[PDB]
Structure 1
């Protein structure tokens, strides 16, 4: 007895005939990337996450906080491109990169991270530690 699938099958898109004209990936890394990309999709069959607690899947989280800083995206991108171009114009930095002797000002990196994208990392780690799961629920 045969039953109809409840949705699209995984490998039903590509054509079985004329396989030699279809491009292949020759990299185990490429296949791993594709497999992990597919494994995160909400499949219609019984998957691993449903049985092992994806925490109710999607959750509409109530946001109680200050509005994000309104930054001019065009001017920010222009300034970032100019800074990158000025860094690229230097020849000593290229020499250091080629010779594998280059250092980073970790203090300035940490300061900039806290200024621009530190809040998101802190929020996600507080999710992971369950601060909001017990403070506001």
Structure 2
């Protein structure tokens, strides 16, 4: 007795008539990447994340935060690209990079992060610590 599958087979899409023509992984890293990308996808069979992964309510996480500020992406990108252009033109920076002895200002990068990407990392860290779950229900 055989019962038809409830969903597409994991290797149903790949043809086998020209498997010799099909390019192989030829490396472990590519297979690992494809494997993790596949594992990060939903499946119709029982899986580890079904039993051990946390379950979230289907409704989107409600936001109470300040509305996001607007910014000109084109101007921002132009200034960033000219800054990196001059940075790469600087030969001393290039020589330090090739000698693997260059150093970055930790205080400066942290101060800039606190204005650029700080809020999102802090929100993610608070969510990991579970504050948004206990308080605000």
> TM (normalized to structure 1)?
0.94
Residue 59 and residue 134 in structure 1: after superposition, are their counterparts in 2 closer, same or farther (change >3 A)?
Answer: same
- 1:25 aligns to what? 25
- 1:37 aligns to what? 37
- 1:15 aligns to what? 15
Q: Deviations over 1:63-118 (max 9, x none)?
A: 00101110011111111111111111111111111111110100011011110111
Q: Displaced runs of 4+ in structure 1, greater than 6 A?
A: none
Q: Which runs of 5+ in 2 are unaligned?
A: none
Deviation of 1:58 after TM superposition, in Å, equals 5.2
Once residues 110 and 58 of structure 2 are traced to their aligned partners in structure 1, the CA distance between those partners, rounded to angstroms, is: 31
- 1:52 aligns to what? 52
Q: Matches of residues 122-137 of structure 1 in structure 2 within 5 Å? A: 122-137=122-137
Once residues 57 and 87 of structure 1 are traced to their aligned partners in structure 2, the CA distance between those partners, rounded to angstroms, is: 47
Once residues 104 and 97 of structure 2 are traced to their aligned partners in structure 1, the CA distance between those partners, rounded to angstroms, is: 12
- 1:88 aligns to what? 88
Q: Which runs of 5+ in 1 are unaligned?
A: none
Give SS of 2:111's match.
helix
In the alignment, structure 1 residue 97 sits paired with structure 2 residue 97: yes
Q: Deviations over 1:11-50 (max 9, x none)?
A: 1111111212111122211111111111011111111111
> TM (normalized to structure 2)?
0.94
Give SS of 1:76's match.
helix
Q: CA RMSD in A?
A: 1.3
Size of the alignment, in residue pairs? Answer: 137
